[PDB]
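Hi L.,

You mentioned the student needs an example of a multi-chain input paired with its predicted structure. This one should do, with 462 residues in total across all chains.
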Amino acid sequence: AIEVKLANMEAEINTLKSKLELTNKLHAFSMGKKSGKKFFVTNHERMPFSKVKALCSELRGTVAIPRNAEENKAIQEVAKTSAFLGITDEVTEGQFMYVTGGRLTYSNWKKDQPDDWYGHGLGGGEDCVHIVDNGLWNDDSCQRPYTAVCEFPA
Amino acid sequence: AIEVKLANMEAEINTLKSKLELTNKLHAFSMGKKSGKKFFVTNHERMPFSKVKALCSELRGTVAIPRNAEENKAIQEVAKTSAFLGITDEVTEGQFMYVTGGRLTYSNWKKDQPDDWYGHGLGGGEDCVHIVDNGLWNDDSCQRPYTAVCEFPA
Amino acid sequence: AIEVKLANMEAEINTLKSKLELTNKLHAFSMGKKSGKKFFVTNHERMPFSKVKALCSELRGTVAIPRNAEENKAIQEVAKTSAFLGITDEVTEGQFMYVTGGRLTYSNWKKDQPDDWYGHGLGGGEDCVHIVDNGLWNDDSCQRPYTAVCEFPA
Ligand SMILES: [Ca+2]
Ligand SMILES: [Ca+2]
Ligand SMILES: [Ca+2]
Ligand SMILES: [Ca+2]
Ligand SMILES: [Ca+2]
Ligand SMILES: [Ca+2]
Ligand SMILES: [Ca+2]
Ligand SMILES: [Ca+2]
Ligand SMILES: [Ca+2]
Ligand SMILES: [Cl-]
Ligand SMILES: [Cl-]
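Structure written out for the whole complex:
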């Protein structure tokens, strides 16, 4: 009895592992994940950068990062409105880096940006990045609430 | 050693339940659940109140109930049409109560509502409530089909 | 303690099956699954027919098949653009059948279709079927990429 029951429960567990994997695949498909490509998701909520970062982390993802003009456009389509990107110069002013580390290999800065402007009156300069109309980028205060868009691996 | 095999399987179960929790969080996120806020969702199907209660119950949720103007708007945006709210005055005519218990603490009645006539016995008249396009409330028969919207805890 | 632990593990497993079923049910609901009706999902990706078949198959579903007017409208609703249907005449030119077997019954052909056209130049005639924006059908080359739409059981 005991060992037979144990061997079965082992099979039951493996079966559930398989079903959950299938469930995740179906969910990814329904969320718009294209075959073999990274995908973006949002709940359309606006919040400060630290909050977006913490939320995406909780979902085992990261703040959306465009690596080319295609993904940049993709992020816009998902967000609809301006959203934070996983890029900041919080560590060293003027040196933007991906929140996952490393220098930028692609950028789409609006003319005259980034400028670390203080005039937004929120205190401090601007160490965060968000997409604006036309898909261009602007550095803004990490305190401003922008649409949370998380990214998940291809 | 069966005790070791048992211990390993218990560990496997905990890993799976953690992954399922993650799957659930990501799904809610993808469907618009805001941080710290209740999650409202619909399949856009119209049915009698009794069917809505059973359906939401089967999903471990309840018929949507707006406790404030913000939530009222969130429900309105999810339904996009006329949908039932988890509120009824079946015990005492005119005294609306939440299906989950308690007296109303917020309402958004249309000027001439509720307009149910007095004197109806059990099941007679208008003892159910539905929200409309603009977010206003109307009382109506629980047998009339309206959009099913369920809510899940924050 | 061994037998007590095994009993608990059995309960842990069944509660996991229960919660997984709940996740699948809520997901279907959020995707618009109507009670007692099969539902449709798409990631909005366009690909050749063979890729759609394989993709839906991996998800435990199949290429969407409109069995009546209602399902046809539901499919164009989810697709929002031209998509393949699970109907072809690969087995016998001129006589269509469902990818899951059986002769085609309900159809919504555009005037002068199907015509097994060779003018497209991709080589061969047209053995696949796709629905257009207005919901009408046309037979086209299985080699052409169209939106991937899967259906899952009622
Ligand atoms: Ca079994
Ligand atoms: Ca800066
Ligand atoms: Ca700036
Ligand atoms: Ca009454
Ligand atoms: Ca009444
Ligand atoms: Ca009324
Ligand atoms: Ca336990
Ligand atoms: Ca043909
Ligand atoms: Ca044709
Ligand atoms: Cl800042
Ligand atoms: Cl063909």
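You could point out the following to them. The CA atoms of residues 26 and 99 of chain C lie 28 Å apart. The first strand of chain C starts at residue 39 and ends at 47.

Best wishes,
N.
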